[PDB]
Structure formats: structure tokens, C-alpha cells
Ligand binder design. Structure first.
Ligand code: HEM
Ligand SMILES: Nc1n[nH]c(-c2ccc(O)cc2O)c1-c1ccc(O)cc1
Ligand SMILES: Nc1n[nH]c(-c2ccc(O)cc2O)c1-c1ccc(O)cc1
Length: 394
């Protein structure tokens, strides 16, 4: 005898476990146990994944209900699991979206300049360099301080909350509350700071004083700042880092994108498709009894949407493990989710990767890992898959 299959299978972000393809072929929805001891339904085919994500009766918000089967412990207040809902209800969705587009004036040039500066600093210091801690993460942090309108010097201290805030823990985390409360107090100060007049925080600070938003809570405005900084920085930093590993281990691609950088957007889209950055399925709570494949999911049950299950499905993406720049369905992957909760930062995330990769390939065309790949240390019990260091030479 053995215990029910447990998730996640592996914290390694450089290879997909063979088990995923066996699950998808034999039982594309099947029961698993999460780190809390709860049972869940693990969905691993493209067809089923999309079904769940496009059916709002599979609820994000209700994942936070008391007594529900849980993937992990909350690290935020329960109302924040409905953060986009709350933003929408307060009439802030359009404003938020306008603030976090990469099309803002000078923002792409800021990204380019910062990428180049970080890489020049590595080149000056000499190999080996750490491309996570000294490239991808500072580039993500700088980008988000600019997007928010907050001082660049405040980036590092906000960033130091993230190794805890994005944990995927069986139990509540005392440090996550200490850092949340501190970060909310910082964003509440920024809304009262007259020097802050640009970016998402400058726009929220104006809307706060506009009569049409007078009944929006000060808690919501501060929470938008904290959440969009942390979600953006973790997601862009982790995605770039793991895409950089995928590129380093494909020199033929690395060399084609060096030689024809116009193919960088198509390459980033494929890097998005194969990316293993999300460590867990996306959770949803069934709010009705709903047939999914061969399983009738019951009201109150937890469903986990495995992005890599969808994104490696050979029925949808033939030769799924290959990076193919000419696919007919290139953006139809689920790297940014699907449906009501589709990533609001998708365009920003794509541009951060594109510019980071362009900059790196121009400055370090001979980039390679400086350790054998098996020596990378994968962060455990986290909402992302990430190596703790990414040592490279060039
Ligand atoms: C490559 C970069 C990124 C990836 C791969 C990514 C991926 C995702 C995915 C998969 C979801 C859907 C979660 C779900 O349905 O349960 C999502 C949601 C979210 N993303 Fe991103 N994201 C990235 C960048 C960003 C950026 C740059 C921001 C903000 C500056 C951001 C903010 C958020 C927020 C706030 C949500 C929650 C939306 C909701 O609840 O409706 N993301 N992201
Ligand atoms: N899923 C999450 N885990 N941790 C967070 C989070 C974000 C910022 C932060 O400072 C603390 C966090 O716990 C989130 C979060 C939750 C909702 C949201 O719209 C964006 C991010
Ligand atoms: N308001 C709630 N408090 N706790 C729950 C809950 C959720 C899932 C479960 O399996 C058991 C519960 O009591 C709910 C809830 C919320 C929505 C729903 O469709 C079913 C139950």
C-alpha cells in the first residue's frame, strides 16, 4: 500500500516530470493530496484545464472560505484573494490597466537602460555572475518601482518580503503578516506623499482624492500597490530566470535569436509556453456539481489547474517539449491563465522578458552555465519554481 498521490511532484523548474504526460494520457483529472492534507482534483489536459478556467462556477474567491479544502495556507487577508474583483467593484480596473502597460512613455527605454547597466556591472566584476540575484530580480524590481512611481531605492526592501510572501506553506506564516502590515503601511504613506505623482501609485493617489472614488477604502488603494508590486516582481523575476536557463540549454536557439533578434518575441512566447515557473496548479473551488471529463466534481471540492499539463499537451501543441517559433497557435498557451482571472500584467511581463533577453544576448552572446545544471538549488514549498542562484560565465 501507498498514500494518495501527493502534489507538487517536483520543485525543479528545468524539466517536466515524466509523470505529467502519463497522468494526462491515463487520468487527465484525478485525485491528489496537497501539502495541507486536503484532497483536490488535479487537471492536466489542455481541454480540461481550459474548461475549468472558463467556467466561473470554479471560483477563485471561494478558495479562501473557512473550512474549505486548501492547496496551501493564506499569506494575505482572505478578501485579497478576490483582489481583482475588489478592484473592479471600486471602478479601478481601467486605471490599473493603463498604469501597468509597457507602452507608457520612456518605460521600455528605462527597461533597456537598466538591463544594460546591470549586465555591464556583471561584465566589469568578471565571471561567474548570478543571473537571478544580479540580473533578473533587480531588473524586475526596478521595473516595478518605475511602474508604481515609487523611488528605486525602496525596491530592495519591498523585495525582501517576497521569499516569504510567496511561500506555499501547509500552515500560516507569522513573518508573512509582519511583512504584509509593514508593506501596507509603506504604500499608505506613498498615497499621502506629494512627491508621488507618476505610475500606478501617482494615479491611485489622485483617484483617492476624486469625488467619484470617495467611498473606496484606503485599505484597497494600499493593497493594490502591495499586491501588484509583489505579483509582478515575483512573476517576472521568476519567469525570466527560468527562461534564461531554457535558452542557455538551447545554444542553437540562443544563436538564432542573437543573429535575428526580431524573432525574440516569438521565442519569448514559446519560452512562456514551456515555462515551469508556477509551482502549483491554479486553485479553484467548485461552487456546483460540475462534470469535468470522467469525474463529477462536487460542490465545495478543490480543483487544481496544472498549467504545464495544458502547455505540454501534444494534442494541442505537437512536439510539446520543442521550442518551435512557427506554431499556428503560439499565444494559445495558459502561461498567463485564461478566463476571468487572466493575468492583468501579461503585456508587461512579455516586454520585461523580451528586453531582458535582447540585452543579454547582445552583451553576453557566449553566456553558458558555470556549474553543471544539476547543481542548481531549487526553492521548495514556494509558489514559484526558481533556482536560488543562477551562476553563468560568458
Ligand atoms: C511572465 C510574467 C507573468 C506570468 C507568467 C504571470 C502569470 C499569471 C497567471 C497564470 C495568473 C492567473 C492566476 C489564476 O487564474 O489563478 C496571473 C494573475 C495575476 N497576475 Fe500575473 N503573471 C506575470 C506577470 C504579472 C505582472 C507583471 C503583474 C503586475 C504588475 C501581474 C499581476 C497579476 C495579478 C494581480 C493577478 C491576479 C488576477 C486575478 O485575480 O484576476 N502578473 N498571472
Ligand atoms: N497569491 C499570493 N501569494 N502571496 C501574495 C502576496 C502579494 C504581495 C505581498 O506583499 C504579499 C503576498 O502574500 C499573493 C497575491 C494575492 C492576490 C493578488 O492579486 C496578488 C498577489
Ligand atoms: N461560505 C463558505 N464557508 N465555507 C465554505 C466551504 C467551502 C468548501 C467546502 O468544501 C466546505 C465549506 O464549508 C463556503 C462555501 C462557499 C461557496 C460554496 O459554493 C460552497 C461553500
Amino acid at each position: 500500500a501507498t498514500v494518495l498521490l501527493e502534489v507538487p511532484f517536483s520543485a525543479r523548474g528545468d524539466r517536466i516530470p515524466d509523470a505529467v504526460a502519463e497522468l494526462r494520457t491515463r487520468e487527465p483529472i484525478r485525485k491528489v493530496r496537497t501539502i495541507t492534507g486536503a484532497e483536490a482534483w488535479l487537471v492536466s489536459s489542455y481541454a480540461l484545464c481550459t474548461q475549468v478556467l472558463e467556467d466561473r462556477r470554479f471560483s477563485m474567491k471561494e478558495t479562501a472560505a473557512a473550512g474549505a479544502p486548501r492547496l496551501n495556507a493564506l499569506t494575505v487577508p482572505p478578501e485579497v484573494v478576490n483582489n481583482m474583483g475588489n478592484i473592479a467593484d471600486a471602478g479601478l480596473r481601467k486605471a490599473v490597466m493603463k498604469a501597468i502597460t509597457p507602452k507608457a512613455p520612456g518605460l521600455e527605454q528605462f527597461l533597456r537602460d537598466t538591463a544594460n547597466s546591470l549586465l555591464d556591472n556583471l561584465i566589469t566584476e568578471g565571471a561567474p555572475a548570478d543571473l537571478r540575484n544580479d540580473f533578473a530580480d533587480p531588473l524586475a524590481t526596478a521595473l516595478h518601482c518605475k511602474v508604481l512611481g515609487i523611488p528605486q531605492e525602496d525596491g530592495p526592501k519591498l523585495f525582501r518580503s517576497l521569499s516569504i510572501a510567496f511561500m506555499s506553506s501547509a500552515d500560516p506564516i507569522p513573518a508573512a503578516k509582519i511583512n504584509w502590515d509593514r508593506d501596507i503601511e509603506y504604500m499608505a504613506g506613498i498615497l499621502e506623499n506629494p512627491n508621488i505623482t507618476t505610475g500606478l501609485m501617482g494615479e491611485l493617489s489622485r483617484l483617492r482624492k476624486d469625488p467619484a472614488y470617495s467611498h473606496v477604502s484606503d485599505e484597497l488603494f494600499a493593497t493594490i500597490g502591495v499586491t501588484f508590486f509583489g505579483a509582478g516582481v515575483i512573476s517576472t523575476g521568476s519567469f525570466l530566470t527560468t527562461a534564461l536557463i531554457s535558452l542557455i540549454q538551447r545554444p542553437q536557439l540562443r544563436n538564432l535569436l542573437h543573429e535575428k533578434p526580431e524573432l525574440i518575441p516569438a521565442g519569448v512566447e514559446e519560452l512562456l509556453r514551456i515555462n515551469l515557473s508556477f509551482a502549483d496548479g491554479l486553485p479553484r473551488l467548485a461552487t456546483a456539481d460540475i462534470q469535468v471529463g470522467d469525474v463529477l466534481v462536487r460542490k465545495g471540492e478543490l480543483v487544481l489547474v496544472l498549467l504545464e499539463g495544458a502547455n505540454f499537451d501534444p494534442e494541442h501543441f505537437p512536439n510539446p517539449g520543442s521550442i518551435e517559433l512557427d506554431r499556428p497557435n503560439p499565444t494559445s498557451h495558459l502561461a498567463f491563465g485564461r478566463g476571468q482571472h487572466f493575468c492583468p500584467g501579461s503585456a508587461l511581463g512579455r516586454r520585461h522578458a523580451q528586453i531582458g533577453i535582447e540585452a543579454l544576448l547582445k552583451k553576453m552572446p557566449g553566456v553558458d552555465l558555470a556549474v553543471p545544471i544539476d547543481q542548481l538549488v531549487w526553492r521548495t514549498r514556494f509558489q514559484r519554481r526558481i533556482p536560488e542562484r543562477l551562476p553563468v560565465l560568458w
